[PDB]
RNA sequence: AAAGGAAAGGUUAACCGCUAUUUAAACACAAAAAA
RNA sequence: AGGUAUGCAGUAAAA
RNA sequence: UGGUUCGAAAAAAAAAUAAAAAAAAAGA
RNA sequence: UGUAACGGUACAAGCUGUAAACAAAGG
């Protein structure tokens, strides 16, 4: 039910294609300390 | 160096089956026991209270039962005494044992006093006779007694080897297609009549084929086992209470001598 | 001869013929009563568990 | 080595990762790389609280990469080294299945390395003879009675979905024809239990003659 | 009355169907026969044997054990023959029609005796076991008699391809046989074996204790 | 040497030692050995993971690339 | 050192026999775990002496003393009746926590003092808004265990649990639902509400170890809704591996009850789940030793004297039959004792009614004996034989088991004392009959 | 051993005429693997024997080419 | 040799209890000699001097002498 | 005859020790103070 | 003839 | 199934280990 | 102080401590 989250959407996921894997792999910047200090 | 033990014992035992059979012989028939017959009786005092009290209260009986000579003692239980002795006989036995214990306690601490000595002598002789009526020369173990009564002899063990029952009456769901020799032991030390011993098949023997692989050819007591050993009209309930100088067999009836029995 | 006999018996097993054996006199190749000694040992173990 | 787990965490640092095994794993099982110092209770609570997984069992092994000697390349330094890290391999058994393509490895280059196909018919080590303890159904307590198929309640529940007669599950290409019980035959062919049927006639018990010279 | 509820009747009918299927399978060999295959097929059990068991329960002929092979040798009931579902299965399935025709043809009318049962058994043509002459023969037993050893050594390449010979032509086995016969003196149709039927239909069988807590060891 | 940490063997472990060697890896204790070879477990000693309700949370692991431009402009407008 | 050869051989044989004895001894220990768990987070951190004078005890002290005595098995009648007297004196001043611990002690020790529960229940009802999960669970649990039935208060406790659903512990809620089902205190609306809440509790808050406690055949048959039944039966197939014989037994009984009384639900199940339960029916589920009671033995003796073959205390399917006749197997008897009804009443328990209905619908002709009527016969055997004969001469009992006449605690106590006296007399005159008493010694 | 700490290289400094091939044991192992694959419908031996770029569906080969 | 040949044994218990870390500590030997897998007192230089371009906020020199809470 | 085991644990006995103590698990069941 | 399944103290006897 | 643990019985200490982290107000 | 074991980092004779190369823009 929830253990699938360890591989869902990653390159280990067997139910999705290469383009979807690449799209899921794209990522942005890490949280800066300045913005983290506001939380 | 190793700490393996139990099922991982590092001891290299022999696997030779003949040597292991010899080991069985040494471990069971030739085993050495430190305790004595009175040690066993004391261990079972709670179940054999009356005989324990008699042994400890009657002069000379303990000395006789502590001697080196290999002996066999048939110990009745308090339950056996209560069931088989008449109420008056049981009351008399209890009173006399208590009397001997009371005299012993007095030692620890006219004609009326003189009669005490005579009564003590009479009670001591009677209770000594009773207790020693169960002591038998030699060491007669349970398997020896069975083999003497003939169990284990292919020519005589009939009626004890192939017991069967009406199976469908007790395990019906498995039977849909059916739903449609007296040995003699030396006399007791206090008497001259040798003791008869025999064997019978228990009620549990017939049910063996229902639950075991068999190779057959073409009230009732609840004591366990397939064979029942009877000694002088009394059933052995617990046998092979081995000691250093003998063996104790537990029985369900006291072997009262004819002299102590009442003719009328 | 052992090889020949084994071949024949295995051939019958493969074919699915009834599980029959030669019934004649089997020679005794051992001296020890291992069957009965081991049976006695098993009896003792069962009694201990009980 | 790893920091000991506090009574209250508030910020777990432990990384649970999926491990691709070259051996076979059952339907409802998955292998994870985990820190060595964690207990089964810790692993189960971690998975149930951070992921909501319904864990049934956790089994653990400690994996230490083997020693390796650098001997091969040009100008080799004959020094010892280990590839990877020591870790706890946690095999978790859950209420639901896990994809084989996720849990196990595959290959079309070395065709023999397909554990999802070969299953437990192969041992993936130097082990030659596989040891398996008796199954739960083969045990006695909570095991399958070999005459329960003849009882009323099982037949009431079977309906038309199941047929309980074991005679229907006999493999024709393995079993032999029935023999005559009055003639020499093997016990292993069709009995498959540890007792002698009464329909087999009386058998001769032979006791060895150990001292023929005496007679 | 005779029944307290539909589930009661359903349980009794299911038990009767299981008993009938067991009896028919044992009649036809319990395996290795196309008749056994058909009796095992789910559709046959669902339709034909279900109707047959219902008919038996209605007829009040609930017999248990080895005494129930009468049911297996009786002809299929006319109610079973006339049930529309049976006819649909017969039309759609060649095996079902073949099996039902065989059952109708090879049956004992009186069961609807032993001579008729023998005739039907012969008609069934269930394969029978046969003990082979090869297993009746003998081959030399080590230790070999010196003449046997010597002859086999001299004729290794001819006599050791098939060493089986009729009883009495092998001295090693003949001597052992004679010794065993002397020790015995000093001391003093082929039919496949079958385990007896363990199923039943009668109340005596259905409502008997399961005896699963008791420790019965001879499970069967 | 033929025994010890030499030749890449490293510190001793129960895997490499004979039966009887006792060496763990750093797990917490969760009970007490008994006098007869048993071990009584106490679940009160199991660490308690503190996990907040992650359902319906708008935060994500990373931040969108435009945040840099937005924040830089919003801070320059103040600095200037 | 060295030994003499005989000594060498004897001691070597002893060592070998000891090894074999150890191996034989460990054979049957499949379910012996060296690692074992003990629960101790309910033990209070305060210290108490259980024998202290009750007049110096308050609620906080007496509750702790009761719970400690229950844990330590210090079942002393004088001590616990002093506990009862002091608790009834302090009824006005107990918190829900203290009342919960008191109920835990009483139920755990099975101290069947009905008066204490009766006197404490009104305060429980009044203080319900302040109760918490553990206290509610404990009150229901103790009442169910001791057979003290108060349907109104049990329903109020269940409603309070529903109102505090966001605060209730899943195990406590499961136990409360099971107790409500066993006591038959939930009308249809409350049953539907409890089923609706339990569905979500099990789906969202309970893992396998917590869920397996929800598998109770009485609740499945009488309380759970159809979706809850389907979910429970499906989930047991997944959670079987962590279950024990009691859980397997209750799952099997639930499946049989659904099949016999709810064929529509049984069919609404899936083929795989039905296959799981069919295969479960084939397993040897470890039971526990059962023996005829004194009343059971008396009824068997009277029946045998009448002349009816029968068998006692045997297992058929997933049920235990008191008496099963041999000549006509469908005829069976049940001997109903004081604990088969609710205290001070002749009303049957839900489990008893469910078993009666299921066996009756599966075909058994059931007849029943009531101890309240049997005790009035005394030691007479002719009267008991006539009673059993007259019962035999009459039709079997319906598939629906109806309750008996009204009774009171006074009559219950009187009948219990009479049964004690009858037991004593029968045992005495059995053993005396056994004893021969024929050896007379001329010792005097 | 794999770390090459043993002295097993000492014998390899001397010639030997040949070495046992353990073909019985190795063939038993290989056939066990083949059976494990074949029960699932895979012809591992055929795959291993296929030529580069050769496609053979089912149990086919040069004989199929001859008779088709 | 006589009978079965016996040579120096490889015994982990003996080696670790007679020549291990603590056993070497208890021995009376030259402890100023470098030992790769055991106790020795050939002391090192510690962390070297910071290069002029490194960040002093990250340069580190002490572990135990400054250990706070 | 060369003269051979007793520590811890289990059993039985005795017992005015103790949550350093058997599920807030469950089954079964004519069953029990004072008055 | 080491210790077996609520566990810590603690005396005696012993197939 | 063993080790661990009690005993034998041991600082007679297997460096990177533990029923072994400052040791009861523990918030039931 | 010094050194080392494991772990992270280009699976390392460097760096480094589960925050394992970096916070410098806080009521």
Automatic annotation (TrEMBL), chain A:
Superkingdom of source: Eukaryota
Location of this chain's protein in the cell: Mitochondrion
Family under the similarity heading: Belongs to the universal ribosomal protein uL29 family.
Name under which the protein is recorded: Large ribosomal subunit protein uL29m
Residues of the full protein shown: 21 to 59 of 236
UniProtKB/TrEMBL annotation, chain E:
Top-level taxon of the source organism: Eukaryota
Biased composition (Basic and acidic residues): 181-188
Ranges that cross the membrane: none
Protein name listed in UniProt: Uncharacterized protein
Entire protein: shown range: 252 to 493 of 493
UniProtKB/TrEMBL annotation, chain F:
Residues annotated as signal peptide: none
Residues in coiled coil: none
Cellular compartment(s): Mitochondrion
Family designation: Belongs to the mitochondrion-specific ribosomal protein mL41 family.
Protein's name in the database: Putative 60S ribosomal protein L27
Organism whose genome encodes this protein: Toxoplasma gondii
TrEMBL record, chain I:
Protein name according to UniProt: Uncharacterized protein
Superkingdom in the source lineage: Eukaryota
């Amino acid at each position: 039910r929830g253990i699938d989250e360890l591989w869902k959407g990653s390159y280990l996921d067997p139910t999705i294609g290469a383009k979807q894997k690449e799209a899921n792999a794209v990522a942005g910047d890490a949280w800066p300390a300045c913005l983290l200090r506001m939380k | 160096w190793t700490r393996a033990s139990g099922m991982r014992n590092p001891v290299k035992w022999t696997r030779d089956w003949e040597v292991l059979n010899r080991k069985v012989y040494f471990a069971f028939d030739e085993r050495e026991i430190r305790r004595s017959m009175l040690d066993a009786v004391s261990a079972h005092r709670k179940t054999a209270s009356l005989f324990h009290r008699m042994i400890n209260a009657v002069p000379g009986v303990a000395h006789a039962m502590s001697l080196p000579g290999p002996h066999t003692f048939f110990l009745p239980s308090d339950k056996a005494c209560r069931d088989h002795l008449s109420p008056d006989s049981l009351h008399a036995l209890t009173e006399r044992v208590a009397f001997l214990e009371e005299q012993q306690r007095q030692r620890v601490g006219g004609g009326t006093a003189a009669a005490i000595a005579d009564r003590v002598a009479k009670t001591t002789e009677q209770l000594r006779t009773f207790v020693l009526a169960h002591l038998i020369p030699g060491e007669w173990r349970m398997k020896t007694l069975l083999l003497a009564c003939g169990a284990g002899d292919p020519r005589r063990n009939g009626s004890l080897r192939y017991q069967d029952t009406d199976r469908e009456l007790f395990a019906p769901v498995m039977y849909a297609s059916r739903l449609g020799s007296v040995f003699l032991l030396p006399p007791p030390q206090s008497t001259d009549e040798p003791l008869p011993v025999w064997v019978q098949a228990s009620r549990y023997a017939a049910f063996l084929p229902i639950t075991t692989s068999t190779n057959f050819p073409r009230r009732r007591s609840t004591v366990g086992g397939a064979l029942h050993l009877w000694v002088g009209g009394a059933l052995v309930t617990k046998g092979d209470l081995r000691a250093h100088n003998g063996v104790v067999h537990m029985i369900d009836k006291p072997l009262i001598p004819v002299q102590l029995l009442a003719s009328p | 001869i052992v090889r020949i006999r084994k071949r024949y018996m295995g051939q019958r097993i493969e074919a699915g013929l009834p599980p029959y054996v030669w019934g004649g006199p089997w020679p005794q190749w051992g001296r020890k009563r291992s069957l009965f000694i081991r049976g006695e040992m098993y009896r003792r173990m069962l009694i201990y568990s009980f | 080595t790893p920091p000991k787990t506090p009574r209250n965490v508030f910020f777990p640092w432990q990384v649970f990762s999926v491990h691709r095994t070259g051996a076979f794993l059952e339907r409802r099982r998955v292998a994870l790389k985990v820190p060595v110092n964690l207990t089964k209770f810790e692993i189960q609570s971690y998975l149930e609280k951070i992921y909501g997984a319904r864990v049934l069992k956790v089994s653990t092994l400690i994996v230490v990469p083997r020693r390796r000697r650098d001997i091969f390349g040009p100008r080799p330094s004959m020094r010892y080294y280990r590839v990877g890290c020591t870790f706890k391999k946690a095999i978790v058994t859950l209420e639901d299945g896990v994809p084989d393509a996720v849990k196990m490895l595959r290959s079309s280059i070395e065709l023999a390395k397909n554990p999802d196909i070969t299953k437990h018919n192969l041992t993936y080590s130097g082990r030659v003879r596989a040891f398996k303890p008796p199954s739960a159904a083969q045990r006695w307590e909570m095991g399958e009675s070999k005459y329960a198929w003849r009882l009323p309640i099982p037949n009431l529940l079977a309906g038309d979905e199941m047929q309980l007669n074991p005679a229907l599950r006999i493999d024709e290409s393995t079993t032999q024809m029935f023999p005559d019980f009055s003639k020499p035959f093997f016990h292993n062919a069709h009995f498959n239990f540890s007792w002698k049927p009464e329909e087999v006639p009386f058998q001769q018990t032979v006791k060895l003659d150990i001292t023929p010279w005496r007679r | 009355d005779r029944f307290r509820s539909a589930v009661h009747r359903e349980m009794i009918v299911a038990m009767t169907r299981t008993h009938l299927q067991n009896l028919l399978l044992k009649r036809f060999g319990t395996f290795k026969t196309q008749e056994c295959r058909i009796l095992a097929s789910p559709a046959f059990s669902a339709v034909v044997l279900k109707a047959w068991a219902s008919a038996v329960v209605d007829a009040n002929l609930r017999l248990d054990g080895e005494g129930a092979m009468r049911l297996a040798y009786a002809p299929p009931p006319p109610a079973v023959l006339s049930d529309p579902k049976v006819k649909e299965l017969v039309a759609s399935d060649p095996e079902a029609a073949w099996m039902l025709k065989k059952l109708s043809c090879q049956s004992v009318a009186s069961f609807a005796a032993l001579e008729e049962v023998v005739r039907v058994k012969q008609k069934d043509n269930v394969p029978q076991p046969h003990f082979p002459s090869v297993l009746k023969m003998d081959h030399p037993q080590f230790p070999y008699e010196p003449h046997e050893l010597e002859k086999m050594r001299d004729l290794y390449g001819v006599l050791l391809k098939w060493p089986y010979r009729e009883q009495g032509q092998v001295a090693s086995v003949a001597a052992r046989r004679a010794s065993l016969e002397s020790k015995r003196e000093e001391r003093l149709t082929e039919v496949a074996g079958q385990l007896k039927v363990t199923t039943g239909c009668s109340d005596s069988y259905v409502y008997a204790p399961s005896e699963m807590e008791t420790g019965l060891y001879r499970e069967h | 040497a033929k025994v010890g940490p030499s030749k890449g063997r490293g510190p001793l472990l129960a895997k490499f030692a004979p039966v009887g060697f006792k060496k763990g890896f750093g797990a917490i204790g969760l009970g007490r050995h008994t006098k007869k070879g048993f071990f009584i477990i106490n679940t009160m000693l199991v660490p308690m993971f503190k996990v907040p309700d992650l359902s319906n949370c708008k935060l994500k692991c990373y931040v969108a690339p435009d945040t840099y431009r937005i924040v830089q402009q919003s801070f320059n407008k103040r600095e200037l | 050192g060295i030994l003499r050869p005989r000594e060498r051989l004897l001691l070597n044989a002893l060592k070998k026999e000891a090894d074999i004895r150890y191996r034989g001894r460990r054979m049957h220990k499949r379910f012996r775990s060296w690692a074992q768990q003990r629960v101790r987070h309910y033990w209070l951190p305060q210290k108490v002496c259980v024998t202290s004078d009750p007049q110096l005890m308050d609620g906080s002290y007496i509750a702790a003393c009761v719970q400690k005595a229950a844990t330590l098995r210090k079942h002393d009648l004088q001590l616990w009746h002093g506990f009862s007297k002091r608790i009834l004196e302090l009824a006005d001043s107990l918190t829900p926590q203290q009342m919960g611990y008191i109920f835990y002690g009483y139920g755990k020790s099975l101290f069947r003092h009905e008066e204490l529960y009766r006197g404490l229940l009104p305060f429980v009802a009044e203080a319900l808004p302040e109760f918490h999960s553990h206290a509610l669970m404990t009150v229901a649990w103790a009442l169910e265990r001791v057979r003290v039935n108060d349907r109104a208060v049990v329903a109020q406790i269940a409603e309070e649990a529903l109102a505090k659903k966001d605060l209730m512990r899943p195990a406590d809620f499961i136990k409360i639902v099971n107790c409500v089902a066993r006591m038959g205190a939930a009308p249809p609306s409350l049953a539907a509400a409890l089923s609706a809440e339990l569905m979500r509790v099990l789906d969202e808050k309970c893992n396998a170890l917590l869920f397996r406690g929800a598998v109770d055949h009485v609740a499945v048959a009488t309380l759970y809704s159809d979706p809850l039944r389907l979910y429970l039966l499906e989930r047991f197939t997944k959670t079987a591996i962590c279950c024990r014989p009691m859980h397997y037994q209750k799952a099997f009984q639930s499946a049989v009850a659904i099949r016999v009384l709810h064929p529509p639900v049984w069919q609404q199940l899936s083929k795989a789940v039905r296959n799981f339960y069919i295969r479960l029916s084939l397993r040897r589920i470890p039971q526990r030793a059962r023996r005829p009671s004194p009343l059971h033995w008396d009824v068997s003796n009277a029946l045998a004297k009448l002349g009816v073959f029968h068998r006692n205390t045997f297992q058929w399917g997933c049920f235990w039959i008191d008496i099963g006749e041999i000549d006509d197997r469908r005829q069976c008897w049940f001997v109903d004792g004081p604990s088969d009804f609710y205290s001070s009443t002749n009303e049957y328990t839900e489990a008893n009614k469910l078993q009666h209905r299921i066996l009756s619908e599966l075909g058994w002709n059931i007849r029943r004996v009531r101890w309240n009527d049997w005790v009035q016969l005394g030691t007479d055997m002719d009267a008991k034989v006539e009673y059993l004969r007259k019962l035999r001469e009459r039709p079997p009992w319906p598939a629906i088991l109806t309750d008996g006449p009204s009774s009171s605690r006074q009559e219950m106590v009187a009948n219990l004392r009479s049964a004690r006296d009858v037991q004593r007399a029968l045992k005495e005159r059995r053993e005396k009959n056994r004893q021969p008493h024929s050896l007379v010694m001329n010792l005097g | 051993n794999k770390v090459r700490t043993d002295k097993k290289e000492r014998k390899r400094a001397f010639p030997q005429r040949g070495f046992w091939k353990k073909q019985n044991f190795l063939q038993v192992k290989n056939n066990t693997v083949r059976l494990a694959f074949a029960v699932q419908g895979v012809d591992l031996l055929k795959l291993k024997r296929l030529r580069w770029g050769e496609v053979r569906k089912g149990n086919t080969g040069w004989w199929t080419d001859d008779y088709r | 040799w006589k009978g079965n040949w016996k040579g120096p044994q490889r015994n982990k218990w003996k080696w670790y209890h007679r020549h291990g870390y603590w056993a070497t500590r208890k021995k009376l030997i030259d402890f100023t000699k470098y030992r790769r897998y055991g106790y020795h007192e050939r002391r090192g230089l510690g962390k070297p001097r910071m290069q002029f371009w490194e960040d002093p906020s990250h340069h580190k020199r002490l572990k135990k002498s400054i250990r706070f809470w």
